[PDB]
């Protein structure tokens, strides 16, 4: 059973539009999504769709890049280390829930050292 997606909007969070959340929209999370291995993390994980009852039984924390991209459009993080605390997460979930040598394991570490190759320089202010 699913519980309710992370929040994308929060009214009493105060936003902020840094040139870093900018890039890692318009850079990152945007050549990230073309990835061909991406497509398992543009979405919540459906624990019903794709049977597996016990996801958020182990994961507390879920992310995806679905969430992280909508986050980004509505301003929603403070700076750059909030939005990539969130990445971490999700890839981290993905290594917690798995075992390592997995298919979904082995498009999460490949995507990984993508985004860590490319937030490796963040523009300035
Ligand atoms: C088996 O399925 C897939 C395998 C590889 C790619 C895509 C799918 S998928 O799109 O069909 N399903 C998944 C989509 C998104 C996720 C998982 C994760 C683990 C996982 N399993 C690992 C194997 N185990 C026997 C079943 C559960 N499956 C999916 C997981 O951390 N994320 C975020």
């Given at each position: 059973?699913?519980?309710?997606?992370?929040?994308?909007?929060?009214?009493?969070?105060?936003?902020?539009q840094?040139?870093?959340?900018?890039?890692l929209?318009?850079?990152?999370?945007?050549?990230?999504?073309?990835?061909?291995?991406?497509?398992p993390?543009?979405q919540?994980?459906?624990?019903?769709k794709?049977?597996l009852?016990?996801?958020y039984?182990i994961?507390?924390?879920?992310?995806?890049?679905?969430?992280?991209?909508?986050?980004?459009?509505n301003?929603?993080?403070?700076?750059a280390?909030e939005?990539?605390?969130?990445?971490?997460?999700?890839?981290?979930?993905?290594?917690?829930?798995?075992?390592?040598?997995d298919?979904?394991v082995?498009?999460?570490?490949?995507?990984?050292?993508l985004?860590?190759?490319?937030?490796?320089?963040?523009?300035?202010?």
């Amino acid at each position: 059973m699913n519980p309710p997606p992370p929040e994308t909007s929060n009214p009493n969070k105060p936003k902020r539009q840094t040139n870093q959340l900018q890039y890692l929209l318009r850079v990152v999370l945007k050549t990230l999504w073309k990835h061909q291995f991406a497509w398992p993390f543009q979405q919540p994980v459906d624990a019903v769709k794709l049977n597996l009852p016990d996801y958020y039984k182990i994961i507390k924390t879920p992310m995806d890049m679905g969430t992280i991209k909508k986050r980004l459009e509505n301003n929603y993080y403070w700076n750059a280390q909030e939005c990539i605390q969130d990445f971490n997460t999700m890839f981290t979930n993905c290594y917690i829930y798995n075992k390592p040598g997995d298919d979904i394991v082995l498009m999460a570490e490949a995507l990984e050292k993508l985004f860590l190759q490319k937030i490796n320089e963040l523009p300035t202010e």
